[PDB]
Every structure is written in structure tokens, then in C-alpha cells.
């Protein structure tokens, strides 16, 4: 009624359901669709479906999903510093996770239901997109350990090939995914 | 008692499509009709405006006006603490836009404005803000309608 989640109906509903997708209008104001608050949402079918996932999609799927969730969790702790000082004063190690969090939040969690191919997405396409994002993050961190500026990582053309993975058809995905993986591997080989 | 959790305003929200809210602050400042745009809302607006119904630029102009007023009111609240000299360049422009908006768009008295006159005044108000700060409006409408001066209604009370 008043937007409060202590209502008797919501409290009685929270006690018997196995999933809870809490929408929020704060992400709808900024035109982020779907507007699911990933901090408050939960699901109790996560663990028990993993044998199906590893017997149907891929063996490393739960670990990759947990890695993406941990990347999203890491960015949530740095907002107390971004809301005090602007992003341009943050250390490069933290700036990397801020950029990767923005990339995840605006390329993987975002979905166009009005689009020709983006409205439908199978498990393997999402698995490939997560693989590409994790490869980007790990190679960027390895380059940081070598010693690089953040702007040369952001300069790389693989940002658009990791962004345009949503709009590829399901028939062209198994070639595009391997091409993008080899391209990012070579591009991070061509770095100091 | 200005309570929206009272049963009569609460149950009206479950059946009707939006609301229009009057403001006591605007009324006490001398503005008539004292309609506060921030809590007001219409839930069927997008189905009744647009190409061939009102005009091409209606929706984006309304969104830009809403966002600019929302910025201006908070800047006005901040000025009382930090002073008007500690502001940036665009913040003073936003503050002046908020004052002109309340003086000209809302406070119309007993005038009977057509939709063309309302859109003309709205486009003249947005010209105070610098071009390129109007993110919510596409560049074609800006090229077609930006740049008019508010003296056309300043001299017409």
C-alpha cells in the first residue's frame, strides 16, 4: 500500500515462497530494465538446480555464476567512497572493479524485451557472455599487475565486442564467442 | 490533515489513474492555480499525446521541465547555506530557471491558454538553460524550437 514491505500480505507471502524478485522504481527512473533490486532479491532454488546445470549447460557454470555474483558484491562496498569523493580519485585496482561492475550492470543484467533477439536468451548464450566478461576482468587485472594505466584498458576495441554480445543470433553465437575470446586473448597479449 | 494514508485518499489511488496535487506553499506565496508538479502524475499521458494528437515534442519537453524543476528546487535549498557565490555557473542558471518557472508557467491567473501557447512558454523557459544540457530532448526538436525569449509573456501579464 505505502510501498512498505512490512505489510501483512507481503509478510505472509514471504513465508511460503521459494523466490522473491523485489522490483524497485529507482532503476526505472534511470531507465534500467528489468528493475530488479539484486541486493534484496533471493532465490532458494539456486543450489538444488546445479546438477541439472552441470549436466546440461556446462561444468563450470555454478562457479562462473558465483564469480559474477561476487564481482557485483564487491562493487557494493565501494559506494561509500564514490559517494564521498568522485570516481577519478580512486586507486586503479578499485577503479577496475568499478568499471567491471558498470559493464556487468549495463550489458549483462540489462535486457531488451522489445528487441528481435534480445528478448529470448538461452543458458549457453548467457554462459558465453559471462565467460567473456570474466576473461576481460582477469586479463585486465593481470595487465594491472604488470603495470598499466586504466585508460589503455578502456581504449581496447574489445569493449564493443563484449557489449554487442546481446544482439547476436543463437546460430552465430558459437563462432562469435570463440572469435571474441581469441581476440581478447591476443589484445591482452599485445599489452605491456 | 494533509494525510495521504487516510482511507479516503488511499482507496481513491487504487481505482483512479494518477492525481493532481495542490500545494499550500505555492498558494501562500501568491501563485494561482497552485498546482505542484512534483507529486502530480497522469497514468494515461503517453496514449494521448504525440504525432497527430498534440505535437511532436510534447513528451520530451514535459520530461525536461520536470527534471529541471527538480534540480532547481534543491539548488534553492542549498543556496541558503553555502551562499550564491559558492555555486557553479550552471547552478545559478538552474536557480533562475526555477524562479522563472514558478513565476510564468504555473502562475497564470485567469488566462485561457491553448496548448500551443503552453508549449511556446515551455520552450521559452527551457532556453534559459544552456544547449546541450537538455539530455532528454532529441536534437531535431531543439533545432526546430530552441532560442525564443520570454519577453513575449513578460510584457503580457
Amino acid at each position: 500500500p505505502g510501498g512498505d514491505m512490512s505489510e501483512p500480505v507481503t509478510q505472509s507471502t514471504l513465508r511460503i515462497v521459494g523466490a522473491f524478485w523485489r522490483l524497485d522504481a529507482s532503476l526505472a527512473f534511470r531507465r534500467h530494465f528489468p528493475a530488479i533490486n539484486w541486493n534484496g532479491s533471493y532465490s532458494l532454488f539456486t543450489s538444488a538446480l546445479d546438477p541439472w546445470y552441470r549436466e546440461n549447460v556446462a561444468e563450470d557454470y555454478p562457479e562462473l555464476r558465483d564469480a559474477i555474483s561476487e564481482l557485483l558484491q564487491r562493487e557494493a562496498g565501494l559506494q561509500e567512497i564514490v559517494q564521498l569523493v568522485g570516481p577519478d580519485a580512486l586507486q586503479d585496482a578499485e577503479r577496475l572493479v568499478i568499471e567491471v561492475g558498470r559493464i556487468i550492470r549495463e550489458d549483462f543484467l540489462q535486457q531488451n524485451a522489445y528487441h528481435e533477439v534480445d528478448a529470448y536468451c538461452s543458458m549457453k548464450k548467457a554462459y558465453g557472455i559471462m565467460k567473456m566478461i570474466l576473461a576481460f576482468y582477469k586479463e585486465a587485472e593481470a595487465a594491472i599487475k604488470r603495470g598499466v594505466s586504466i585508460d589503455e584498458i578502456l581504449q581496447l576495441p574489445v569493449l564493443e565486442r563484449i557489449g554487442r554480445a546481446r544482439y547476436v543470433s543463437e546460430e552465430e553465437f558459437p563462432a562469435y564467442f570463440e572469435e571474441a575470446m581469441k581476440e581478447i586473448q591476443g589484445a591482452f597479449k599485445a599489452l605491456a | 490533515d494533509d494525510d495521504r494514508t487516510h482511507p479516503i485518499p488511499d482507496l481513491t489511488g487504487y481505482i483512479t489513474e494518477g492525481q493532481i496535487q495542490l500545494s499550500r506553499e505555492l498558494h501562500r506565496k501568491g501563485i494561482y492555480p497552485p498546482i505542484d508538479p512534483l507529486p502530480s502524475l497522469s497514468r494515461l499521458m503517453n496514449n494521448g499525446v504525440g504525432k497527430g494528437k498534440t505535437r511532436e515534442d510534447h513528451k520530451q519537453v514535459s520530461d525536461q521541465l520536470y527534471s529541471a524543476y527538480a534540480n532547481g528546487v534543491d539548488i534553492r535549498k542549498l543556496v541558503a547555506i553555502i551562499g550564491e557565490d559558492a555555486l557553479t555557473e550552471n547552478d545559478r542558471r538552474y536557480l533562475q530557471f526555477a524562479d522563472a518557472f514558478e513565476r510564468f508557467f504555473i502562475n497564470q491567473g485567469q488566462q485561457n491558454r491553448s496548448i500551443e501557447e503552453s508549449l511556446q512558454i515551455a520552450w521559452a523557459l527551457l532556453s534559459m538553460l544552456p544547449q546541450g544540457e537538455l539530455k532528454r530532448i532529441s536534437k531535431d526538436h531543439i533545432g526546430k524550437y530552441y532560442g525564443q525569449k520570454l519577453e513575449e509573456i513578460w510584457g503580457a501579464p
Binding site: 567512497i81 564521498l84 569523493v85 580519485a89 580512486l90 586507486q91 586503479d92 578499485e94 | -
Partner: protein, 104 residues
């Protein structure tokens, strides 16, 4: 203006017309600084970097009373011929003021 350091720069300081005293050890510098702050009359005091890194760190029981004297650390003798880490000193300053120690 009062300034305590190695006498080799104190000589130039009294050449310029500024009051200068020599220091050689930590306890000597602390006693000299406490006598300088306790004695009234001046507005600015400069202390070294080799012996006492932070001047206001030791006079904390006295600086809370009056605020007109200003303390300030300067470089040493051999350090000025090669410089020091101004970036590190200001990073430490940003840590002590804003509390988060995150700046690049």
C-alpha cells in the same frame, strides 16, 4: 620568525633577520620546541624533518589553549640538496585530514 634546525641553516636564518636556534637530538629538539611554544610573542615557528617529523604532534597539550602561533615542518640540510617526497607527505596529510587515504 622563530625556526629551529641544524645550526648551519640557523646561521642563514639569523642572517635574514629570523630568530634561529640549533638542535641535534630528539630530546633537545623537544625541549627547544616546548620552550619556544611556552614563551610568547611570535606568530610563526618552523621545525625540522629529520629529528621531529610532526611539530604539532608533541605540543598537543599546549596548542589547544591559544591558536595564534603556527607550526610548520621544513626540509633538512642534506635533504634539500636532493629533495624529498612531497607526494608522500601530502598523501599522509590527506590521510590525517579526510581519513580515507585514497588519492591519485
Amino acid at each position: 620568525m622563530a625556526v629551529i634546525a641544524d645550526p648551519e641553516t640557523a646561521q642563514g636564518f639569523r642572517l635574514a633577520g629570523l630568530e634561529g636556534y640549533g638542535a641535534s637530538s630528539a630530546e633537545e629538539a623537544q625541549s627547544l620546541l616546548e620552550t619556544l611554544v611556552e614563551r610568547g610573542g611570535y606568530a610563526l615557528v618552523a621545525v625540522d624533518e629529520a629529528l621531529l617529523p610532526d611539530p604539532e604532534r608533541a605540543v598537543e597539550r599546549l596548542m589547544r589553549g591559544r591558536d595564534l602561533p603556527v607550526l610548520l615542518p621544513i626540509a633538512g640540510l642534506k635533504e634539500a640538496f636532493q629533495g624529498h617526497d612531497v607526494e608522500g607527505y601530502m598523501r599522509e596529510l590527506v590521510r590525517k585530514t579526510i581519513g580515507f587515504d585514497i588519492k591519485l
